[PDB]
Amino acid sequence: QTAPEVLRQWQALAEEVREHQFRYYVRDAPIISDAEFDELLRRLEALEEQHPELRTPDSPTQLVGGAGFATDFEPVDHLERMLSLDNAFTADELAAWAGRIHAEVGDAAHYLCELKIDGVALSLVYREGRLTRASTRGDGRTGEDVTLNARTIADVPERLTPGDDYPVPEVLEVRGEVFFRLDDFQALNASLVEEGKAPFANPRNSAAGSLRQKDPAVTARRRLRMICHGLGHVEGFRPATLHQAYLALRAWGLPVSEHTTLATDLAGVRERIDYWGEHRHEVDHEIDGVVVKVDEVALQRRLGSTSRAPRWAIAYKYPPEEAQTKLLDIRVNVGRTGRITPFAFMTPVKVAGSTVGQATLHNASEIKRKGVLIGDTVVIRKAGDVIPEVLGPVVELRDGSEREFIMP
């Protein structure tokens, strides 16, 4: 089941189900007819079962959790739009985009190539250099006031270091991606295990949970990472190309990356796409693909966007590196030095194209302190890209009828 455009039937549905889930729960102000029961949830739920590989811990069709500021979160207001990205097929053309530029750019534009990571969208608001609000995505228009929780730095300053050609804008709204580092996602995943909560599945969900804490003391201890990857509303600034915006974005002391090339033309654009995907695996934190933006600010407003995504950028996206499947039995395997290795056998899954059911656990302590037990539902990363791994179990799936490991 290698999904071709099935992801386009799913990404634009699921994420279009969070919108109303925000509005309904977070606002007491729903926009469409149904509630409690939808409609799209529904044609979504049915789709996820068949084609079954689209399931994720953070899908709104196996989730419900509110809640309301403690602070965990209550509604703010994004200064500008706050929209998604159109998707380049895994795999292929594309160019339909770069030739859509034929239209009204004048094929002499300039493409910005940035790495598109996994994590929670985070818009930040800095008035006169003082960070005021910092909120989640919401429904694009308005989001959850997570300011106190993100204030707990360490990548996101309270202030903007001034002067020497980048005078702090009267108002600056940047927008970026909060994430956990791959290794010390795991170094927390076990550090707890219990003591209140449970182990997280992916760092994609780990980053969400830690952001939305009630006590900001909790989130001041977990690290979290911040990488600013675009502009929202602006007053008394705005560049002329995006980079330009990024020299400024560190002059002021905001976490930028990458790994950003530019990228004179479509040839150098596949030069990076085909470079990552091959090289995508070997980095600090998970990257779903490559996001390509036309450098010159004018051309962007000149091409314009819609209320779904901009016309001036496509998100090129590699095969998904994780999936969710049921850990049927960790049996064993034997080799040549001192130890046998607890190979975890599960039900089949299509991740990174290849269908696999043979994800690994290195050692005794490796196991256990990942919170896994025979019968559990598990998430597996194609982290090599070779031998599959296991990030964590999704505990909210109870059953209670499945238990600890042994073997002597």
Look at residues 71, 89, 120 and tell me which one is the last residue of a structural domain: 71
* Torsion (CA) 145, 151, 153, 155 in degrees, nearest 10: 50
Domain count, the chain: 3
| 155 and 24 in a common domain | no
> Is 85 assigned a ligand-binding role in the annotation?
yes
CA distance 399 to 344: 20
| Contact of 78 with 139, CB cutoff 8 Å | no
Same domain, 250 and 356: no
Q: Is 214 annotated as a binding residue?
A: no
Method used to determine the 3D structure: X-ray
Q: Where are the alpha helices (DSSP H) in 76-194?
A: 147-151, 182-189
* Among 203, 201, 199, 198, residue whose Cα is nearest residue 182: 203
5 labelled ligand-binding: no
Picking from 85, 84, 82, 73, the residue whose alpha carbon sits closest to that of residue 21 is: 73
Q: What residue numbers bound the domain in which 349 lies?
A: 322-408
Of 116, 350, 370, 382, which residue is the catalytic one? 116
> What is the crossing angle of helices 203-211 and 182-189, to 10°?
70
135 among annotated binding-site residues: no
- CATH no. for residue 345? 2.40.50.140
Please tell me whether residue 291 adopts helix, strand or coil conformation. strand
- Specify the resolution in Å: 3.5
Task: Please tell me whether residues 18 and 46 are part of one structural domain.
Answer: yes
Do 248 and 386 fall into the same domain? no
CATH number of the domain that 206 lies in? 3.30.470.30
Same domain (yes/no): 215, 352: no
Residues 92 and 230 reside in one and the same domain? yes
Does residue 376 share a domain with residue 364? Answer: yes
Residue 34 assigned as binding residue: yes
3: tokens are 């999904």
Active site (annotated) includes residue 197: no
Q: Collapsing DSSP states into helix, strand and coil, what is residue 203?
A: helix
Rounded to an integer, what is the distance from CA 33 to the centroid of its chain? 30
Question: Exposed (0-12), middle (13-18) or buried (19+): which is 403, by Cβ within 10 Å?
Answer: exposed
Cβ count near 372 (within 10 Å):
24
Q: In the structure, how many helices (H) and strands (E) does the chain have?
A: 10, 15
In contact, 118 and 204? CB cutoff 8 Å: yes
The residue from 48, 71, 94 where one domain ends is 71
What distance in Å separates the CA atoms of residue 100 and residue 311, rounded to the nearest whole number? 9
Check the annotation: does 137 bind a ligand. Answer: yes
* Same domain, residue pair 382 and 287: no
| Three-class HEC string of 331-356 | CCCCCCCCCCCCEEECCCEECCCCEE
Cα torsion 403, 193, 66, 152 to 10°: value is -170
Whether residues 107 and 119 share a domain: the answer is yes
Residue 158 annotated in ligand binding: no
Verify that 336 and 313 share a domain, yes or no. no
CATH number at residue 30: 1.10.287.610
Q: Choose among 8, 32, 36: nearest CA to 20.
A: 32
Together in a domain, 370 and 290 = no
- Does residue 31 sit in the same domain as residue 84? no
350 is in an annotated binding site: no
**What type of residue sits at position 165?**
D
Q: How many CB atoms sit inside 10 A of residue 51's CB?
A: 16
CB 218 within 8 A of CB 210: yes
Q: Which of 289, 321, 353 is the last residue of a domain?
A: 321
255 Cβ contact list (under 8 Å, min separation 6): 155, 156, 176, 225, 226, 227, 228
| C-alpha–C-alpha distance, residues 352 and 347, integer Å | 16
Contacts of 178 (CB under 8 A, 6+ apart): 119, 120, 121, 122, 150, 207, 211, 224, 225, 226
